[PDB]
Amino acid sequence: EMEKEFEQIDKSGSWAAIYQDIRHEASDFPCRVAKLPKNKNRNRYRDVSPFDHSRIKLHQEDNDYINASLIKMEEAQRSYILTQGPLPNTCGHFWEMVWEQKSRGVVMLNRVMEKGSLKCAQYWPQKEEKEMIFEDTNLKLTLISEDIKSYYTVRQLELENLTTQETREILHFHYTTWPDFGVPESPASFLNFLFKVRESGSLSPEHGPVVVHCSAGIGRSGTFCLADTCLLLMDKRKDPSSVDIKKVLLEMRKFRMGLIQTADQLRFSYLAVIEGAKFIMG
């Protein structure tokens, strides 16, 4: 299986080497639009842009740009939209996307503040009576309920298209315990968090793709989607041990750069998939 490979790479301590090959082999596509001058203030990181071929487009003239990519996993039949944590000026764009793409869930893998810095704008209302209105995209966001757990928080939000008065319920899954430095010691919490998102139906095909982000929307976001897809695959095909994490990761990297930012993140991904496979299929 992959656990053997995991214990192997660990034994020889070649994770960094394993990770480098991936980066070297990683796909390279143009990000022209993300580079246009008019979109400079719509990007969080200069080294984190969406490829033109898989970028999500806002359904509006003037500027259809948002730093978000559609990651379509054909075999696993699962799609994810990976994006950057909204900026003070792109919160309206962020929810416009959620609306236009018909997403049911938003997965947040970071805290608004980490390492003493703001890694993301406060894009959702923190109190029921203090709704948020996004004038530019003409949308209203209202906090309906909030369930705070030790490792994550789930919120029910009501998104209303002020233009048509139509409303939709959005589930916000906020993983709040990813350490400021490195990765979690054990994947237990992360897996439970993933299973929670799954059980909500937010990842199901009847809905638009789930929207995932952290700070750059690649490191933790990549780990989340990689783990989910690998587990699905091990559940769908004849021999589960045929699932090649590296292959899946390369496949995903064809849609957005940076997925999995460090060799430590890669190891953790293996660890999550391995442990998750034991829970799913004993």
Ligand SMILES: O=C(CC(=O)c1cccc(OCc2ccccc2)c1)C(=O)N1CCN(C(=O)C(=O)CC(=O)c2cccc(OCc3ccccc3)c2)CC1
């Ligand atoms: O965190 C880092 C470390 C890093 O690699 C980096 C990148 C470019 C320049 C740099 O100076 C040199 C330096 C070295 C050591 C100490 C201070 C300063 C450091 C950071 O100094 N920053 C975050 C965002 N940033 C950038 O220049 C980026 O734009 C980096 C990026 O791509 C990125 C941003 C958020 C998350 C992510 O991946 C998930 C993750 C979660 C937890 C731990 C490790 C990784 C990747 C500016 C400040």
